Amino acid sequence: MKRTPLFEKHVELGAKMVDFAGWEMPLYYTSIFEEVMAVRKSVGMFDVSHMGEFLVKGPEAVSFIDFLITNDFSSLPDGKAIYSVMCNENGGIIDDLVVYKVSPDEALMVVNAANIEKDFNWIKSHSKNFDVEVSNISDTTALIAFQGPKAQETLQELVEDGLEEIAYYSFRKSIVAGVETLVSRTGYTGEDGFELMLEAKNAPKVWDALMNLLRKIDGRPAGLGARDVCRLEATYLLYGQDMDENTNPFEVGLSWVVKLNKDFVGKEALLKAKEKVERKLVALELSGKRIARKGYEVLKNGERVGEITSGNFSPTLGKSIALALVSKSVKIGDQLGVVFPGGKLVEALVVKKPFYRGSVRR
Ligand SMILES: O=C(O)CCCC[C@H](S)CCS
């Protein structure tokens, strides 16, 4: 499996490993529960160096990105990032991503680990009519997520610049633990937090420095188990599970990242799709302790309406929770049935999204 520059640190910490998107990653160090509460009460640090980073440089960096993504990148000022999806000609979701507007001539794209190759090829195969050069800097770039209500107060003593000045989804170049870093107020937890992008060679040092500060405030390094629990509670999507090229943005609740007033790949397809949204992604709270898995059929009074996309147990709400792609007719308050292996039906209630909102800003 592929190993991030912090693999050795995870091994030393005695973490239980799991294969994620071809990477040997830490599922948890102590327990998924302990790590989730760390994110919810103080701070949890995640190694997300498996994520990819693409750099677009050139006079038409802005128009190129705007042509590729569904969201409005043309308006974004320097130092701002934006969440979005990148669609194919038929409006299917190729991947969701975050794009940083460094300057008129430079943009950085952060994409999912499993889609690095696919995304990069897609992006390169579309640079032809744009005065830009696209490069993949994933191989030498690390990314650390420092999340929690006490994330800012704990991280600040190692950062050369003021963090309070950095707004939600804003970023800046600074120095952390003596090394250059692109610090952003972003996250996948629903709490306040930051992500630290840095040269891979510097990952171990920054990580060690941060670990030292965590043991002081009862914080903890957190694995993928805790990462999934927190994002699901926050009701954030995971490409490959909650959506893929067979779903358009409107079907999974991402209408807000699609700006149809501009031209972009999949635009025409989406105009027609928007007129007939027959599916929606709903939040479910199941009875019992059994956890739903992707693919389990979802029923309404004995009739199928969809299927589970993501499932896990939320210690924050103390319930088995799930996301499910179902027919438009499903509404909040509905009583549904999730079919577990062996045809065993488990009751589930449709609830207003998101399940939980923490200290995350703006
Ligand atoms: O391995 C697991 O059990 C799932 C955790 C997946 C981690 C997060 S939810 C995805 C990274 S974008």
Architecture of domain 50-136: 2-Layer Sandwich (3.30)
Does the beta carbon of 291 lie inside 6 Å of ligand 1? no
Tokens of 279: 């599916």
Tell me the sheet residues that pair with 197. Answer: 143, 182
Mutate to test the pocket of ligand 1, among 224, 313, 314, 323 (most ligand atoms within 8 A of CB): 224
Right CATH for 1-49+137-234 from 3.30.70.100, 3.40.1110.10, 3.30.1360.120, 3.40.50.300: 3.30.1360.120
Does the beta carbon of 227 lie inside 6 Å of ligand 1? yes
Q: Which pairing describes strands 93-103 and 106-111: parallel, antiparallel, or unpaired? A: antiparallel
Quote the CA–CA distance of 241 and 309 in Å, as a whole number. 5
Does the beta carbon of 50 lie inside 6 Å of ligand 1? no
Quote the CA–CA distance of 128 and 243 in Å, as a whole number. 28
Domain coordinates of the chain in residue numbers?
A: 1-49+137-234, 50-136, 235-275, 276-362
CATH superfamily, region 276-362: Aminomethyltransferase beta-barrel domains (2.40.30.110)
Tell me the sheet residues that pair with 26. Answer: 17
Question: CB within 8 A of 188, min separation 6: which ones?
Answer: 145, 147, 227, 230, 231, 234, 236
- Which CA distances in Å does 94 have to 39, 91, 302? 30, 9, 33
Question: CB within 8 A of 34, min separation 6: which ones?
Answer: 220
Mutate to test the pocket of ligand 1, among 4, 228, 314 (most ligand atoms within 8 A of CB): 228
- Cα–Cα–Cα angle for 181, 195, 140, rounded to 5 degrees: 55
Q: Which pairing describes strands 133-136 and 52-57: parallel, antiparallel, or unpaired? A: antiparallel
Of 340, 342, 302, 341, which Cα lies nearest the Cα of 322?
Answer: 340
Resolution (A): 2.0
Quote the CA–CA distance of 236 and 149 in Å, as a whole number. 18
Question: CB within 8 A of 39, min separation 6: which ones?
Answer: 147, 148, 189, 191, 222, 226, 230
Mutate to test the pocket of ligand 1, among 83, 97, 227 (most ligand atoms within 8 A of CB): 227
Of 55, 56, 54, 59, which Cα lies nearest the Cα of 131?
Answer: 59
Q: Which helix (H) or strand (E) holds 301?
A: none
* CB 82, CB 98: distance < 8 Å: yes
* CB 39, CB 222: distance < 8 Å: yes
Considering the domain 235-275 in this protein, what is its CATH number? Answer: 4.10.1250.10
Does the beta carbon of 39 lie inside 6 Å of ligand 1? no
The method of structure determination was X-ray
Alpha-carbon torsion, ordered 22, 51, 115, 282, to 10 deg: 100
Alpha-carbon torsion, ordered 184, 188, 191, 192, to 10 deg: 0
Does the beta carbon of 348 lie inside 6 Å of ligand 1? no
Angle (deg, nearest 10), helices 32-41 and 224-233: 50
Quote the CA–CA distance of 30 and 219 in Å, as a whole number. 12
Tell me the sheet residues that pair with 52. Answer: 111
Does the beta carbon of 26 lie inside 6 Å of ligand 1? no
Of 245, 230, 269, which Cα lies nearest the Cα of 354?
Answer: 230
Does the beta carbon of 25 lie inside 6 Å of ligand 1? no
Does the beta carbon of 20 lie inside 6 Å of ligand 1? yes
Q: Which atom of ligand 1 is nearest to the CA of 48?
A: 11
